[model samples]
Target: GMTILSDVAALGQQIWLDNLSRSLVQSGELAQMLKQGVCGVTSNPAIFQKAFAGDALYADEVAALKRQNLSPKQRYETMAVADVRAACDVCLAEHESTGGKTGFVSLEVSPELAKDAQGTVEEARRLHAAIARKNAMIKVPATDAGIDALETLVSDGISVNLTLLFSRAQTLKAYAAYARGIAKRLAAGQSVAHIQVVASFFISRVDSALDATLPDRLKGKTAIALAKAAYQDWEQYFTAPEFAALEAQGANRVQLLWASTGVKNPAYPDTLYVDSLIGHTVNTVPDATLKAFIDHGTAKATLTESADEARARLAEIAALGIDVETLAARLQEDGLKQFEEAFEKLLAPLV
Candidate 1:
């Protein structure tokens, strides 16, 4: 059972559940998944919002928290921190086995602070301390300010999951910030062995944004093409000659984690993102798609396949007069607003 998922894990990519809920952590389901090759977990405001809305295990704690004097955001954090901490415990074995390279569970800072670099850093510090787990990762947006926060957080020795990336430019910018952070830490004579980071690039959202505006032939190709190209960039930044000095210093190479991978268009294969993106990086999948891949997904080094073709496809899009950078900016803004709204809505029921 779930041989395919194990196969994917063996091929080098780490499979992380893009969810966290009280039942998932307490019911032994998450532990069961670890046996089936899932090594990590990621949660955002929207994911937590849905989990709190339907997961019955949170009921007892929710009621208890409601009676407290805490603000709605505080109540939400209280519950969220507990779940993420439990998840970190559940996946601790993987963390140890991999020597702290994987088995991370991420909790995001308030989306409302995404644009405030200092505020993001302060909140990330609080959350990291709240979870109190080495494997616990703090998620921050890939906004300009968040990128600034990312550098400080990394230097402060906080593991980060940089979220909402949409294009090669955004991803490269993230890499630069991450490198700057590592350089600062090394300069301070800090051992970076404990610092881990993943820049999360959203997948399905790219296609959903461009499909309607593109020709039929290009309808389903944008996201995968963009991902493959970004992977190429990752190799240049992390594995190429430029990063060898950092590598020698025992600094961990920040990896690219595939996010928002659930396929939205029914015409596409259910496991399109998973099957197409198998590499040394990570893929944080939603529940349904995780099961889908477990049941019938192919595990191969498809991320490195068609390298030249992927670049050409991106050029093709540019030739069609589409400003990918502009599109990326809009996608990022929309992503921030969605997370903010979800955070607001989730906190409402708490109050």
Candidate 2:
């Protein structure tokens, strides 16, 4: 059967998998995803923790790494770096075909470093080298520290998938860092063509927080609405004359990436995040949501149409005493803490 996901891809946006594991790469599932039009892969501590615990895919590798007397962290990276490099290999042709517009694999740094800017930068540099692949993106959280590390990483030519953006302000911070990075790279005479940054908007979390207090008309709408409001910031900055001048020198725009696209509440449509927010961005879906969309989604580039209403919806949420800025900060804190928990579990058994 034909899939609506294809239609969405034809509309000029990129779809990426929100999950990655050794089985996915070794079993050729990620490759099949590339065939099905998923252009990228994202992995995190929770993703790897789940994957490692689920199967014997890493039995031999873990056994081998254990005998080497490496620390738990080094063993963990040995396994994950291989998976990321393999995923990147799977996406190589798509990467070239899109002229680097798509086909990226994201591996996050240790969540413990979220508050340490210099430590985060050093580890990102190390991870980039350890992965040793051009299409591999280092995932950095959008903390204040992460903002600093992101600029330094990009200036040094590391591709970044800047994650955990939950508000307009956070998005602006990521963009400002992106500008400094691009300027540094250009001033150093490095080609900005290969340097990429994606500010990932954490969706669904917004609504789940405020849903309990909203009217039916307003329920389940804030995430996309807020996303669209932020998308305007993306539009303005990327299209500005100054940005265009950088583009002429081979700088790529800091693309908007929509994460947490899966619906957390059953009261909402299964494809709520994916279908409502399409066009001119990246949407990374997990296995369940990806299949749900391929099976029963009505694809359209609807993200561009609801601008006025989107802004109004944000205003309405604010009027209801749901502060967007505060929600974003809360969510960013929660996101980092969640990863921190997962990172602990991820390393607990390995050592």
Best by lDDT: 1
- Candidate 1 at 133: error in angstroms? 0.1
| Residue 169, candidate 1: C-alpha displacement in angstroms | 1.1
The regions of model 2 sitting more than 4 angstroms off are: 1-3
lDDT of candidate 1 over 1-351, digit per residue (tens): 487777877888899999889999788999998877889999999999999999998889989987889999999999999999999999999899989998999999998898999999999999999999999999999999999999999999999999999978988888888888888988999989889999999999989988988987788899999999998888888877657788799888889999999999998999999999998699999999998988788888899999898888889999999888898889999999999999998988898
TM-score of each: 0.98, 0.97
TM-score for candidate 1, please give it.
Answer: 0.98
Candidate 1 positional error at 186, Å? 1.3
Alpha-carbon local distance difference test for all models: 0.91, 0.89
